Ligand binder design. Structure first.
Ligand SMILES: *C1=CC(=O)C=C[C@]1(O)c1nc2ccccc2s1
Length: 108
């Protein structure tokens, strides 16, 4: 997987301080509908690798990070730019739709 896995511990280096925008997928190990977005994210990570990084955070095992960023529904996607959560996406989408939301902030 072109996507990366992040934790509470790794979040600051992996996501926050990244000079490249990161799309973070807040998901649950025990939620099946929350895993539906994974393949699409995988396609995106490979296809748009120069423009964007894709990260996956398991809210089940990293509760504080999920709470700090105020994730209320799963799956949730938050785009991080220069350390800030600049974009929040709820309701799982198709690829074209997801890419359209992201284009406002990401080139290509
Ligand atoms: C709720 C209950 C469940 O059994 C699986 C995970 C969940 O948190 C979610 N359910 C849905 C259903 C539709 C879309 C998204 C989610 S998350």
């Amino acid at each position: 997987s072109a996507t990366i896995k992040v934790t509470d511990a790794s979040f600051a280096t992996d996501v926050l301080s990244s000079n490249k925008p990161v799309l973070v997928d807040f998901w649950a190990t025990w939620c099946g509908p929350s895993k539906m977005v994974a393949p699409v994210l995988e396609e995106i990570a490979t296809e748009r690798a120069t423009d964007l990084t894709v990260a996956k955070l398991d809210v089940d095992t990293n509760p504080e990070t999920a709470r700090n960023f105020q994730v209320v529904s799963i799956p949730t996607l938050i785009l991080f730019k220069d350390g800030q959560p600049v974009k929040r996406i709820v309701g799982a989408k198709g690829k074209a739709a997801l890419l359209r939301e992201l284009s406002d902030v990401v080139p290509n």
